[PDB]
């Protein structure tokens, strides 16, 4: 999921521009015999242009690899272009080139932006500005946080004055869909990164308790709630901790937003808050299984409405 | 069926213009939690633009509502545009905005115009003028009456020097088709709103008696005959009476054209004429079931032709 | 439509038995070069058994004949068997063999019996007795008249205490279906060949006037009403007159039952009654086009029910 | 849903036997003109045998009726046979004939038994005894209560030492399926009609709270829990009250089993318990909307398991 | 893969008989809430009969488990029957019941026997004797070794005077097929468990070198060669070592037949021979990666034939 | 396969231009009766333009000829255009016209170029220069040798610093595909026509021995390796010898590049080297069957990698 999997740099017109790879060039690369010291260099397919460094092979699916991406689809091309336009608007310098490209990002998030972008009803279709801003945050090249308007997208299943809830269409993705057919994940974005009233929070918590009782409300600390099956918070806990460590080992400032305590699942708030307080993985995961104790009457109200 | 279900007003360039809704914006609105005092205001979906007031929800079909319209079809879009072009040619003022938009109209009539408009053989395809005039009468913003050239359309099943008979293709509609598969309805329009000869009337009555003996000839008082199954005149009687009352309660001038007595079904002429004389619903419906008594030899002639 | 098209006689066990033809044997016959004096003899295909006399060739469809029957279907076989069982129960003698077999009958009527016979819900499926009686009348080897229980069949579209109305499924036949896709014909059979009350007649005439106004009520004189389009009574008039002549030329007693005058279409009753009075074809057909003059209130009642 | 819709009585061999109707006989009946005083007598189709009294017409679907059953399917036949075998094992007397046959029962319940019966893995397939007992309770001719082994059936979605939970496959029924595609209903049967431990009850309540939070736990008083959407308890409340009245007006002993108070939804227990105390409909329905107040920690446990 | 997954014991007629499970009974079991001390007891589904102990749940596929078997196929039933007939011919005693049933066997091997058995051209179809003997060795209840005639089966791709080579059709299995679409595995069985000539060995080694150069020739020590991709010998090495340990820990006599040294792949013969000499896993696997050194001219001969 | 099968010359603008034939014109020609002395002249179809000389008839497939090409496909047109653009860039003179056009070339090679050309990822799509150069060598009008960049194309199955290996997609060709479904052929092109290191040769020989052990490495002497089944080198040997003779009889300089001795199959190098030394066909083919004798350890290395 490194940006180097979709494009390569080219100083042209005294500046850094980025070019999408040709899937056939990637195809050729995957069949190449490469001298060891060249595993980290761009590959010349001769017939189809430059291709990613052979050290990234495992990122692409083959008849003996399904943990990668389906680079021979259109989406791959579209996702690559999406990345390039955003990177080109940055005018990166030799100094930063490898850093940007070495950055691992979410392919699903990017495919979702493509789907927004190519949709004439979606603002992103009408605003190169928002589109760029939305992509920039998605590829870690922006400080702003993802809000409703800049969201990766999906199917809106609930909306309020303060939040917007999306169903992540990952199962139906072309590039790198989720493989487990029993997967189901939602995302809640703030419409505005400003203070929210108790009332408009109550509405959100009521909808999650009623419509999604079998889901845990968590967050990856980037300003958005993630709705995941309770039987999945373990993995989520794992990956977020890794990412926390990485930045601690990478020196990268870990700015984890715990979000509203009233909304996040108890155990998660614990595991997470512990992590921030700079703790160990094992000490953290303890709290996810630790059956704890500490709005109300919501289910009853919604129940009564229905009746 | 209120015009507010397809568009919203926007004072731009010092005048009122109307914009079609995005189905996805409507989609989002239908999943929204709305504070009570906002049920009558346009909804901001954020991602897809403005959407109709949430007080109109029941106008759209969902997995738990089939009494609405299939707003996620193209037709919806087309019908919305149709309405907008017509409304824009009016240059409505703040004073009249809500009135026009609050007006309930027939969606089927509008889908039928779209079908005429997009048909290169149909004049409406070649005349923005007629098209506008045809739409204006359809959305109650014109005084002229619907005649053959401005008809909602359908399949011409009979034509004369004075009339044109159309089969209403409602079953095969995209936006809001009739659901009962045993439905069948025709419409007869005058080619010209001028006096008609006895002869050219005789031809029309002969075709209705022969080809449509199981149909009642009625009218909704807007200048056109409606051919409906006898097992349906009850509902028709109901809705036309309501509309009569509404305008009496709304102060709106009720100008009901009873049309030719020689053509309209006896009982209907009664029920209707009674209504005009300002009577009660119950007093009116009496006459539809009251087996009464009072051209001829027509069936015999047509019968002889056949043989 | 001669019985000789489905079977051949074989004196075995000192009596006449009849055998169904093999379609392939018929197939071979149709490709045979036959000496003139053999056109009226059964054909030996050698490989597939006996086949009908080559003088009947035009009775079978080929790539250059569609006025015949589709003898290569199962139905052909079934219809042949049907005929044989009935003929075998007669124990025909040398004296009568050729007469029975030379008799022209209706193939559609026979296919309809097969459909009744093979239907477990139909009595004919449970009674070899009725089945035989029904077939015997169909192949002109019985004096009884076709009544509801012995009817050729079809879809019951109306039933009363005295009559049963059937839709003739000829379009969907396998052996010799009607080719004109705009064909539509009904048949009314008496449930009992006894006197019928005025009331139970009124019900029948009311259903024909309401539900079938574009149909003429006639009869071929064999005791059953035939409901045919007015644009078809001409042909019907023709064929029935021919059949009348044939029997007059054949000496065969013409017993034509005009049926109830109150039900039969006026002009038809005339044309027919004239025919019986022993008249000319031209003198007879005159009356079908002669726009004449002489129960009531029926349509109004049915109309009122509907409303 | 009266038993008279599937069979008719025939005293043969000095006893009452019951015979299934032929769908074509029903078909004919539906097209019959019947003298008023005969609306309550069995109809003779002549060709297809006896048919139900024409007063039951609305029980069968036609091109202008979808509130009936699809009698032209196999299921109809199967369901009819099912009923007959059970009724025949009773040896009903002239005295009781009309009572048994006039009894309204659930067609869906009967189709479900057919599905059990014809399933070689299901005991009912191997035991004419249980099958009969299961049918007898289903057609109100038995005092025993429906338990797991005699259940109408469906898909087992949960099972315990004391209960068995079934998904009602009504949407996929042939004879009289539910038409609303958003329908979903479950049924919980006791494996034994004996006292149940608190523990094995706790398991049942935990599964309903976790897996079916959007469902109300009610009962029709016949010894089994019914799991229905909260947006449906209104209708359920209505029909059960009617049935309560009917038996009070019919003098039929109303033995309504309120079932465990710990399991039944609060408001329902109220509405129901009120009904038994002999109260009014309006006084009863009050309690369904009356947001009340009065095991625990279950959701938390199940939540923890998942994690 | 324990025999307890397909059947249960029943002392009937003073002896032990085994019965196949009903898939629906297994289905119910998988939805059951079971008290801990009952995880090792047979489950009573009530409606579908006995089912396997809930402790084996993971052996069956569900919407959240693909590492099990597709028990709802016919094959499951067939494989179960296959096992039962064989076990019933043993007349097992209370003393041995649990041992036999606790035995883990290969499901693919059993599905392959079913395919042989149901094939009229295959001897196993004509000999209950061989069939039983073939099954008995497959479920570890026989001392004889699998030879060509008693082979699990597959597609014969090569045959000699001494051996028979089969392609394992695992990908196309119904019950528990291989999931990796790039899987390919062969099996070589001796036609007779007697000494083989050098010549008829040479033919076998020549066919493996030419036609299967990218395959390693190994064995699981039960008397048959297994042809597997070199990129798979690692797993094979793992599982065979485990099985070796198990029997050492289980006290079960480990009789591993290294087979011909001239045929088995060098490294495998090492790894294996080491294992027998009673060594450690790590010490054993060393030799599989240890690029060693020590018939000929075979490829050249085959190459020349082709040309 | 003569260039005259796709185009005809036309001196226009004082120079030679070439025009593609219309398939329908060819179609007409194939049905023409031609006077003998006209078999070598272009044919005038009158309606579809000029067509090839009737002496080439056997080059086109008909309902009684499958040894030709499917000229009624698009590919035919495309391949013709491809040839014309290349020939037009030559500005051929009257003196050379017939020579160029009489030249027999490979149609498959040309279809492959079309596939490269029309592929936006392929350089040939972006460079009229390379495209022309690639075509020119393919139609024998260039001295340069085919290298990776100018290759006919196919699916890249292996690539190195010095070579590129392609799978010839001949089976799936439109114009003149290979008919034997068991056909399989590869081509190895040098990326640069410069000296290659021993190492980068070793990689190529290792991939051929491992992945293609059942294939002979040969060459047609034009600078590229051809990978063919050993059961096919006979034909290859035949055709290359013919071509050698032709040029010796045609006086055309035979410049046959034997390519690397370390890579070419032994026997082939012999047969070929013999041919060059100017020998007889029979003397040459001897060596292909003569089982001879004279890098290593490669298979073992690759084998070890896999494990």
* Closest CB to A63 among E63, E64, E182: E182
Provide the 3-class DSSP secondary structure of residue A139.
coil
Choose from D182, D183, D214 for mutation: most chain B CBs within 10 A: D182
- Pure H helices in E43-106: 74-88, 97-102
C-alpha to C-alpha distance for C225 and B69, rounded to whole angstroms: 49
DSSP-assigned beta bridge partners for residue E62: E65
Q: Which of D1, D8, D98 is nearest to D51 (CA)?
A: D8
Q: Which of C104, C119, C144 is the last residue of a domain?
A: C144
DSSP code of residue D263 = T
Of D299, D305, D295, nearest in space to D198 by CA: D295
Tell me the C-alpha to C-alpha distance, in Å, between residue D295 and each of A290, A297, D300.
21, 18, 12
Number of structural domains found in chain F: 2
Task: Say how far apart CA A7 and CA A77 lie, in whole Å.
Answer: 10
Contact between residue E232 and residue E226 where contact means Cβ atoms under 8 Å apart: no
Residues near E189 by Cβ (< 8 Å), separated by ≥ 6?
Answer: E146, E147, E148, E151, E163, E164, E166, E224, E225
Burial class from Cβ neighbours inside 10 Å (0-12, 13-18, 19+) for residue B177 reads: middle
How far, in whole angstroms, is CA C83 from its chain's centroid?
Answer: 14
Contacting residues for F234 by C-beta, under 8 A, at least 6 apart? E307, F285, F288
Q: Name, in order, each residue with C-beta under 8 angstroms of E60's C-beta and a sequence gap of 6 or more.
A: E5, E26, E30, E68, E69, E71
Interface residue F150 vs chain A (CB under 8 A): no
Does B26 lie in the same domain as B90?
yes
Q: Which residues contact D94 (CB under 8 A, 6 or more apart)?
A: D11, D16
**CB–CB of B121/B176 below 8 Å?**
no
CATH of the domain at C254: 3.30.428.20
Do F175 and F264 sit in the same domain of this protein? yes
Two tokens, residue B30: 């239908």
Instruction: Please report the DSSP string for F212-224 in residue order.
Output: TTTEEEEE-SSS-
If you measure CA to CA, which chain C residue comes closest to B292? Answer: C300
Give the single-character DSSP code of C225.
E
On whether the CB atoms of residues C206 and C160 are closer than 8 A, the answer is: no
Give the one of D31, D45, D47 whose C-beta lies nearest to C157's C-beta. D31
Q: How far apart are CA D133 and CA D86, in angstroms?
A: 8
The secondary element (H helix, E strand) that includes residue B143 is none
Same domain, B162 and B263: yes
Alpha carbon distances (Å) from A262 to A206, A256, A284, D52, F196: 11, 17, 20, 64, 70
Chain C residues whose CB is inside 8 A of the D32 CB are 158-160
Query: Domain holding C122: CATH number?
Result: 3.90.1400.10
Distance between CA atoms of F234 and F286, rounded to whole angstroms? 11
Strand partners for F16 = F11
Smallest CA-to-CA distance from F264 within F243, F287, F239 is with F287
Same domain flag for A271 and A179: yes
Q: State how far the alpha carbon of E204 is from the alpha carbons of E154, E161, E235, E259, in Å.
A: 18, 10, 25, 14
E171 lies in the same domain as E48: no
- The DSSP 8-state label assigned to residue D44 in this structure reads E
* Separation between Cα atoms, residue E27 and residue E46, nearest integer Å: 12
Which of A144, A178, A197 terminates a domain? The answer is A144
Q: How far apart are CA C138 and CA C151, in angstroms?
A: 9
Report residue D205 as tokens.
């309540």
Q: Which CA distances in Å does A254 have to A1, A101, A142, E6, F157?
A: 20, 20, 15, 54, 45
> Using the 8-state DSSP alphabet, how is residue F58 labeled?
G
CA dist E90 and E113 (Å) reads 19
> In angstroms, rounded to a whole number, what is the distance separating the alpha carbons of residues B286 and B267?
9
Residues in chain D closer than 8 A to E35 (CB atoms)? 161
A281: number of Cβ within 10 Å: 16
Number of Cβ atoms within 10 Å of the Cβ of C282: 7
Report CA-CA distances (Å) from F119 to A77, F111, F125, F127, F185.
15, 13, 6, 12, 22
Whole-angstrom distance, CA of residue A75 vs CA of residue A82 = 10
Q: Are the beta carbons of F164 and A46 separated by less than 8 Å? A: yes
Computed over its alpha carbons, how large is the radius of gyration of chain D? 21
Outline where DSSP puts E strands in D213-270. Answer: 215-219, 225-229
Nearest CA in chain B to C297: B293
| Euclidean distance between the first and the last CA atom of chain D, given in angstroms as a whole number | 48
DSSP state of E32: B
Q: How far is CA A210 from CA A175, A202, A260, C88, D303, in A?
A: 33, 12, 19, 78, 15
CA–CA dist B52, B7 (Å, integer): 7
**List of residues 6+ apart from B203 with CB closer than 8 A:** B160
The distance of D32 to chain C (nearest Cα, Å) reads: 5
Residue B190 in tokens: 């005058």
Total Cβ atoms within 10 A of residue F202: 16
SS3 B87: helix
Q: Domain end: C144, C171, C189, which one?
A: C144
Instruction: Give the Cα separation of B223 and B156 in Å (integer).
Output: 18
Helix (H, G, I), strand (E, B) or coil at E65: strand
DSSP secondary structure letter of residue E121: T
Question: Which of F216, F225, F153, F156 has the alpha carbon at shortest distance from F190?
Answer: F225
CB D65 within 8 A of CB D56: no
Residues D298 and D209: beta-carbon distance below 8 Å: yes
Pairing outcome for strands B50-51 and B43-44: antiparallel
Strand partners, A215: A229
State the Cα–Cα distance between residues E41 and E9, nearest whole angstrom: 12
CB C77 within 8 A of CB C174: no
What does the block give as tokens for A147?
């809000």
E214 close to F (CB below 8 A): yes
Q: Which phi and psi (to 5°) does residue B39 adopt?
A: -65, -20
Q: Is D176 helix (H, G, I), strand (E, B) or coil?
A: coil
Q: With contact defined as beta carbons under 8 Å apart, do A192 and B61 qualify?
A: no
Partners of residue C50 on adjacent β-strands: C44
Order of all β-strands in the sheet with C225-229: C155-159, C163-167, C185-190, C225-229, C215-219
Distance from the Cα of residue B74 to its chain's centroid: 20
Yes or no: say if B134 and B124 are a contact pair by the CB < 8 Å rule. yes
Report the distance separating Cα B275 and Cα B240, nearest Å: 9
Q: Which of A119, A123, A159 sits opposite B32 (nearest CB)?
A: A159
E247-267: b (≥16 Cβ within 10 Å) or e: eeeeeeebebeebbeebbbbb
Residues 6+ apart with CB under 8 A from C5: C21, C52, C56, C59, C60, C69
What is the strand order of the sheet A155-159 is part of?
Answer: A155-159, A163-167, A185-190, A225-229, A215-219
| Minimum-distance CB partner of D47 among C149, C203, C207 | C149
Cα E104 from chain centroid? Answer: 10
- List residues bridging with D7 in a β-sheet: D20
- Residue C214, class by beta-carbon neighbours within 10 Å (0-12 exposed, 13-18 middle, 19+ buried)? middle
CA pair distance E273, E279, nearest whole angstrom:
9
Residues 6+ apart with CB under 8 A from A94: A11, A16
Which residue is closest to A62 within chain E, CA to CA?
Answer: E182
Q: How far apart are CA D287 and CA A304, in angstroms?
A: 11
Residues F249 and F294 in one domain: yes
- Look at residues F237, F231, F148 and name the one whose alpha carbon lies nearest to residue F191: F148
Termini Cα distance of chain E: 48
- How many other β-carbons are positioned within 10 Å of the β-carbon of residue F239? 10
Helix/strand/coil for D194: coil
| Residues in CB range of D244: below 8 A, 6 or more apart | D254, D256, D275
Contacts of E234 (CB under 8 A, 6+ apart): E285, E288, F307
Residue E292: how many other CB atoms lie within 10 Å: 11
**C-alpha closest to that of F142 among F134, F130, F153, F154:** F134
In this structure, the number of other CB atoms found within 10 A of the CB of residue D40 comes to 12
**Run of H or E including E287:** helix E281-289
Q: Are E225 and E263 in a shared domain?
A: yes
Do B102 and B250 sit in the same domain of this protein?
Answer: no
Q: Helix, strand, or coil here: C44?
A: strand
For the beta sheet containing B155-159, the strands, ordered from the edge strand earlier in sequence to the opposite edge, are: B155-159, B163-167, B185-190, B225-229, B215-219
> What is each CA distance from F167 to B8, B183, F146, in whole angstroms?
61, 63, 16
Is F307 near chain E, with CB under 8 Å?
Answer: yes
Is the Cβ–Cβ distance between D197 and D204 less than 8 Å?
Answer: no
Taking CA F94 as the corner, what is the angle to CA F92 and CA F95, rounded to the nearest 5 degrees?
Answer: 95
Q: Using CB atoms within 10 A of its CB, is residue B8 exposed (0-12), middle (13-18) or buried (19+)?
A: buried
Grouping H, G, I as helix, E, B as strand and the rest as coil, residue B270 is helix
- Is the separation of the CB atoms in A266 and A292 below 8 Å? yes
**Residue D222 tokens, joined:** 């016949």
- Torsion over CA: B282, B284, B288, B291 (sign): positive
List of residues 6+ apart from F299 with CB closer than 8 A: E213, F206, F209, F210
Sign of dihedral through CA atoms B247, B251, B253, B259?
Answer: positive
Shared domain for C13 and C84, answered yes or no, is: yes
DSSP-assigned letters across all residues of B200-233: HHHHHHHHHHHHTTTEEEEE-SSS-EEEEEGGGH
* Same domain as C301, residue C224: yes
Domain with A55, as residue range(s), is: 1-144
Residue of D nearest to E24 (CA): D121
Task: Please name the method used to determine this structure.
Answer: X-ray
Q: Which residue has the tokens 């991709």?
A: E229
The secondary structure of C51-104 as a DSSP string is E--GGGGGGB-BTTB-SSB-TTSHHHHHHHHHHHHHHHTT---TTTHHHHHH-B
Q: Identify the three-state secondary structure at position F134.
A: helix
Say yes or no for a CB contact (<8 Å) between A291 and D300.
yes
Q: How many CB pairs under 8 A join A and D?
A: 43
Q: Structure tokens of B186?
A: 């025709």
| Dist CA D270 CA D214 (whole Å) | 19
β-bridge partners, D159: D164, E32
Q: Rg of chain B's alpha carbons, rounded to an integer?
A: 21
CB proximity list for B28: less than 8 A, separation 6 or greater: A156, A159, B43, B45, B46, B47, B48, B51
Q: Exposed/middle/buried for B33, CB within 10 Å: 0-12, 13-18, 19+?
A: middle
CB-based contacts of B11: which residues, under 8 Å, 6+ apart? B17, B94
Q: What is the DSSP string of D68-136?
A: SB-TTSHHHHHHHHHHHHHHHTT---TTTHHHHHH-B--HHHHHHHHHHHT-TTSHHHH-HHHHHHHHH
Q: Which residues of E touch A61 (CB under 8 A)?
A: none
- Are D108 and D173 within 8 A, CB to CB? yes
* Rounded Cα distance, E81 and E114, in Å: 10
Residue B187: which region, alpha, beta or left (left: phi > 0; alpha: psi -120 to 50)? beta
Residues B212 and B277 in one domain: yes
Q: Can you tell me whether residue A72 is helix, strand or coil?
A: coil
How many Å lie between the alpha carbon of A97 and the closest alpha carbon of chain B? 33
Contact C271, C284 (CB under 8 A): yes
Helix (H, G, I), strand (E, B) or coil at E239: helix
**How does DSSP assign F62-81, residue by residue?**
BTTB-SSB-TTSHHHHHHHH
Q: Does B47 touch chain A (CB under 8 A)?
A: yes
Is residue D231 located within the same domain as residue D259? yes
In sequence order, what are the residues at sequence separation of 6 or more whose Cβ sits closer than 8 angstroms to the Cβ of residue B273?
A: B258
Phi, psi of F60 (to 5 degrees): -115, 140
Q: Which residues on C lie below 8 Å from D25 (Cβ)? A: 121
Residue found by looking up tokens 């029709």 in the block: D220
SS3 content of chain E, % helix, strand, coil (to 5): 45, 15, 40
The set of residues, in sequence order, having a beta carbon less than 8 Å from that of C171 and lying 6+ positions away, is C177, C178, C181, C183
Q: B64 CA to chain D: closest CA distance, Å?
A: 7
């Amino acid at each position: 999921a490194e940006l180097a999997c979709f494009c390569y740099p080219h100083l042209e017109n005294d500046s850094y521009k980025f070019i999408p790879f040709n899937n056939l060039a990637i195809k050729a690369m995957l069949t190449a015999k490469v001298d060891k010291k060249d595993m980290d260099k761009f590959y010349d397919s001769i017939i189809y242009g430059i291709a990613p460094p052979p050290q990234f092979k495992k990122r692409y699916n083959t008849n003996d690899n399904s943990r990668g991406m389906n680079f021979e689809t259109i989406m791959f091309t579209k996702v690559a272009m999406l990345i390039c336009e955003a990177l080109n608007s940055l005018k990166v310098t030799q100094a930063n080139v490898s850093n940007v490209l070495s950055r691992v990002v979410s392919i699903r998030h990017l495919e979702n932006l493509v789907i927004r972008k190519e949709n004439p009803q979606d603002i992103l279709f009408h605003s190169k500005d928002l589109l760029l801003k939305s992509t920039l945050i998605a590829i870690g090249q922006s400080k702003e946080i993802e809000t409703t308007i800049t969201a990766e997208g999906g199917e809106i299943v609930f909306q309020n004055a303060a939040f917007t809830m999306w169903k992540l269409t990952y199962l139906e993705h072309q590039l790198m869909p989720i493989l487990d057919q029993n997967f189901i994940e939602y995302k809640v974005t703030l419409n505005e990164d400003k203070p929210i009233s108790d009332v408009h929070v109550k509405e959100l918590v009521a909808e999650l308790r009623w419509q999604y009782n079998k889901f845990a409300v968590i967050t990856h600390g980037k300003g958005a709630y993630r709705i995941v099956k309770y039987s999945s918070v373990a993995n989520h806990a794992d990956r977020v901790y890794a990412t926390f460590k990485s930045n601690v080992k990478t020196g990268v400032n870990n700015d984890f937003n715990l979000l509203d305590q009233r909304i996040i699942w108890q155990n998660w708030y614990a595991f997470t808050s512990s992590m921030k307080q700079g703790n160990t993985l094992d000490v953290c995961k303890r709290l996810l299984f630790q059956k704890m104790k500490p709005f109300k009457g919501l289910s009853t109200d919604r129940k009564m409405d229905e009746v």
